[PDB]
Symmetry: none
Subunit: 51 residues, 4 copies
Amino acid sequence: MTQQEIFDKQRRLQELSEKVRTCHQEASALRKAAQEKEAEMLQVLEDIQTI
Amino acid sequence: QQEIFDKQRRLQELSEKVRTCHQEASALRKAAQEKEAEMLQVLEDIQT
Amino acid sequence: EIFDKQRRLQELSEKVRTCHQEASALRKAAQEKEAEMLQVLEDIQT
Amino acid sequence: QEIFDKQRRLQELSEKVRTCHQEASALRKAAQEKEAEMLQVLEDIQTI
């Protein structure tokens, strides 16, 4: 229960918070890519139906 | 024969099912984007 | 202070997990449904 | 005699759907791994 421990704990939170943010960016990008790819696939299906 | 036409109808229903899956997945992705954005703000709020 | 923020993060973390588990199940089902649609799409052209 | 071109298009597009399925699946699988990775880090925050 001291400032040293407080400073350490805060230092770790910031490092882990950064990690979490990175993971958020990557995951979001992957999800969007999946979305667009699915849309593409459906569009190719519609193209098969067209001819 | 009739079965081949029936297979085409089944293919259509399958495609529609896939479309449904895609829409639901879209909803879940948007929800995930919203939910993660709020907690990421809490982490940025922990800073400071 | 920091402990309170940990509890708030814990609240939202369980929400993200639930949304994650829900999406994971749909991902498996989406792949299978597409595979069947493809399997049908392959058999129709003999 | 447009059937030869149409049949070639049907085959090619079918293959394209098959590849888009594989690519989508891998991207979805990659997304799940990242979410799992994110959650594991969030567990570390609970540990302080």
